[PDB]
Design a binder for this molecule. Structure first.
Ligand SMILES: O=C1[C@H](O)CO[C@@H](CO)[C@@H]1O
Ligand SMILES: O=C1[C@H](O)CO[C@@H](CO)[C@@H]1O
Ligand SMILES: [Co+2]
Ligand SMILES: [Co+2]
Lengths: 275, 275
């Protein structure tokens, strides 16, 4: 069964952390990995390495060619830059936006459709969280001006309160839906004691990507109600699914492949969310 | 689709807490409730009220007749009695076992197949937890001598450590499988940050009943991977499913019925676990 599913490359970090694309080289193990991921049936990647204008020590144009030639789309990337104490205090985030301009140019050239902040710290005050919301709106606008969408990926910590407000809820309510979506990591929502579906119903259309992760292999633990999540996918607004596997019951590549196979065999997972 | 599913009567406590079966009466609202639960398609009940030799102010023989005449089996009951500081210190739990003798006689007469302790406190030491394990073994033996099985129902607190050992694991490892099973409340395992399936694989056959609960209606939240749980049901050793619904999106009776309908429509829920 062919379905659109991205792989978060963090899932294969054990291979990718050791590949040597420095000093003009292209590591055959890097290319082989990409080709194997396509052969498993992944349709696209989400990067988890962006540093010094490069993805896994490849220029954006190289990364594009590498991924596309393996039969994969360049879908998304996890990267962000936090605000300085200064920026937070002044609310002036010019400095940080300059970095984003370079980040965004690089992502565009790699053929990315999305850029997603993986993490932010729980701030001390709602005022700080507010500044972050404004910064994300502006990053998101710049992404759109360069053909891409910006989103925010959660763990569990966002379900805590800042002053007396749940951080996640506040972030959703104070970001412009045109410019910021939420890449809901459903596993982490459940770990954070919350209901993916209730979030979908309360903020329909904001969850344009899912991170589909589990305790180990996807769909194995009993810890994530994928069936209910997918049944409510229309309300969520999801357009792409990103599989992530960071902890394993078996060899990594095999783990990543059986994880996919869960989604391909699941009758409630449609073959595309972007038709 | 007919399947065997019990209803935990705690789910309809709002009705049952107000019914008047005192002074020789049989409340028509009580009987109607039972009949409605059968009409929804529940096949059996698990009681959540045992006090003064009675179930909802009915003698065991009356309760049996009440439930059975509505078209339901009397499957199980939630009740327990904790040990005194004395009993824990001496390790002599005669006093408590006397109560259990009466409890067990009453359960037998009601036609019960199972008796399940709903709750115990996290003890201070492994020595206390040990005494509890021995007490449960002896309760369980008495239950078997009277034709029934004793089990232990979890929330999330059992996933904490006592000295340096997870309480749940210790309880499982230090109880006799003949005499104590675990009524795994899969929702609470997941809330307690753990994997139902991993518990099944680590302690196959110990989980002879499931409590099938969710945040509100069963199967609605995204918070419980029922599909994976049920796929691994053989390893668990489950023989009966008990639906519980304690928090509602709609009127109680309707909530309880749509909760069931999730299981009846779920292809991974078999029509019986006791064939
Ligand atoms: O799921 C994960 C990790 O839990 C950490 O955050 C994300 C950043 O790449 C990643 O995909
Ligand atoms: O699920 C529940 C509650 O969460 C409390 O424990 C059980 C006792 O009847 C009940 O079925
Ligand atoms: Co993730
Ligand atoms: Co329960």
């Amino acid at each position: 069964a062919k379905k659109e599913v991205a792989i978060q490359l963090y899932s294969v970090r054990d291979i990718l952390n050791k590949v040597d694309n420095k000093d003009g080289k292209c590591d055959a193990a890097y290319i082989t990995l990409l080709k194997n991921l396509a052969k498993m049936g992944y349709t696209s990647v989400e990067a988890a390495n962006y540093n010094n204008g490069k993805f896994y020590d490849r220029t954006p144009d190289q990364f594009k060619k590498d991924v596309e030639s393996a039969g994969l789309k360049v879908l998304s990337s996890h990267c962000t830059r936090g605000l300085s104490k200064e920026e937070l205090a002044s609310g002036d985030f010019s400095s940080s936006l300059q970095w984003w301009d370079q980040c965004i140019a690089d992502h565009k050239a790699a053929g990315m459709s999305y850029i997603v902040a993986p993490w932010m710290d729980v701030p001390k005050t709602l005022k700080e969280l507010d500044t972050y919301c404004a910064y994300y709106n502006e990053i998101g606008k710049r992404c759109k001006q360069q053909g891409m969408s910006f989103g925010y990926h959660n763990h569990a910590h966002e379900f805590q309160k800042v002053e007396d407000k749940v951080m996640y809820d506040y972030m959703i309510e104070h970001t412009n839906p045109e410019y910021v979506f939420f890449q809901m990591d459903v596993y982490w929502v459940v770990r954070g004691q919350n209901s993916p579906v209730d979030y979908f119903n309360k903020y329909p259309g904001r969850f344009k990507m899912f991170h589909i992760k589990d305790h180990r292999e996807i769909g194995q633990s009993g810890m994530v109600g994928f069936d209910a999540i997918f049944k409510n996918a229309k309300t969520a607004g999801v357009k792409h699914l990103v599989a992530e596997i960071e902890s394993y019951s078996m060899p990594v590549e095999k783990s990543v492949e059986v994880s996919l196979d869960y989604l391909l065999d699941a009758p409630f997972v449609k073959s595309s969310y972007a038709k």
